[PDB]
């Protein structure tokens, strides 16, 4: 039974050779969207896929069959929304003809893209018994919107699912769904934003208009963030969804090392390129239970890895001006020392 080991290298090649024949279809299921705190639907590094080695010139009906089987669903009670990267640095689900663009080879539906990520829409697992089917979708008068709730109090995003809705329907007819899915009372006054892309978070002003108008460049996969219109958002440092998405686009992790501690491993803080000295000192101060006026920061020599000039506590710049001398790996870093009393 060692000759069963003439076949480990007979596929360590037979597969290395045929590899050009196959593509990697990376399925994502909607659950992987919960918790995600950034833009778009997930995070390619923290996302987890169900991977499919599928024949480049395979068929799509063949995939749905293989798919339905492997994951355990009815080849007719599910939907494939191929993930699609856009010119604005955003990857969102896009339509697919599950019957017309189904005469084609799998590789070309991918647009010669491998790997090929595809959002897998499944009927809810509860609604299953109910005789629930996955509702019909008119690829011309309906749209699929994804819903995120923003909580200023935690400054976190709570996924709220998706919805088939006709375009003609008006934003006002969507707010009840939002209150509901967010665990909110009905008629709770809400504020709404389309997440267009990083740093762009347009606020949706006129509710009583149809989506087709209410959303600039409406498309399947657009994203509406909503939040309570409550006065206690104003005690939050990022009171609106927009302010969160800004501070997140501007967000940057920085290492801090005590100059006096030799080979100080130091620690990481997450800061914002448009913070100023007070904001940085106040932050890093909290992270060590000591007064900010007790921290002496040093600029960056940018060449030697040792602290540069002492940073006067009246520094008129921003955190960015201090960090512009860094590159990739060079793990953006400054030096401090604790002061007496």
């Amino acid at each position: 039974r060692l000759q069963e080991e003439k076949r480990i290298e007979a596929q360590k090649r037979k597969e290395r050779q045929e590899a050009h024949l196959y593509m990697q279809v990376q399925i994502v299921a909607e659950d992987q969207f919960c918790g995600h705190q950034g833009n778009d639907m997930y995070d390619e590094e923290k996302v987890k896929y169900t991977v499919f080695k599928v024949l480049k010139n395979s068929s799509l009906a063949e995939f749905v069959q293989s798919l339905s089987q492997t994951m355990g669903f009815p080849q007719d009670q599910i939907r494939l929304w191929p993930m699609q990267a856009r010119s604005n640095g955003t990857k969102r689900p896009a339509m697919l003809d599950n019957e017309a663009d189904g005469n084609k080879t799998m590789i070309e539906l991918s647009d010669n893209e491998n790997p090929w990520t595809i959002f897998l829409e499944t009927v809810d697992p509860e609604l299953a018994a109910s005789g629930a089917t996955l509702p019909k979708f008119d690829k011309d008068h309906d749209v699929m919107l994804f819903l995120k709730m923003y909580d200023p109090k935690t400054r976190s995003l709570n996924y709220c699912g998706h919805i088939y809705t006709p375009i003609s329907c008006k934003i006002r007819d969507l707010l009840p769904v939002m209150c509901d899915r967010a665990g909110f009372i009905q008629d709770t006054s809400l504020i709404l934003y389309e997440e267009v892309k990083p740093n762009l978070t347009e606020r949706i002003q006129d509710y009583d208009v149809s989506l087709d108008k209410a959303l600039d460049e409406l498309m399947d996969g657009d994203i509406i963030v909503f939040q309570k219109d409550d006065p206690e958002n104003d005690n939050s440092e990022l009171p609106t969804a927009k302010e969160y998405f800004r501070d997140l686009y501007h967000r940057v992790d920085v290492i801090f090392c005590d100059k006096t501690i030799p080979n100080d491993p130091g620690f990481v803080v997450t800061l914002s390129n448009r913070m100023n000295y007070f904001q940085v000192a106040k932050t890093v101060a909290q992270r060590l239970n000591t007064d900010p006026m007790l921290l002496q920061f040093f600029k960056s020599q940018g060449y030697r890895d040792g602290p540069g000039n002492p940073l006067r506590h009246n520094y008129e710049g921003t955190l960015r001006d201090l960090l512009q001398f860094f590159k990739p790996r060079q793990p953006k870093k400054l030096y401090y020392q604790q002061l007496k009393m």
């Binding site: 856009r86 010119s87 375009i167 460049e217 409406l218 498309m219």
Partner: peptide, 6 residues
């Protein structure tokens, strides 16, 4: 009129 590109 829902679009096709961005």
């Amino acid at each position: 009129r829902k679009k096709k590109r961005k």
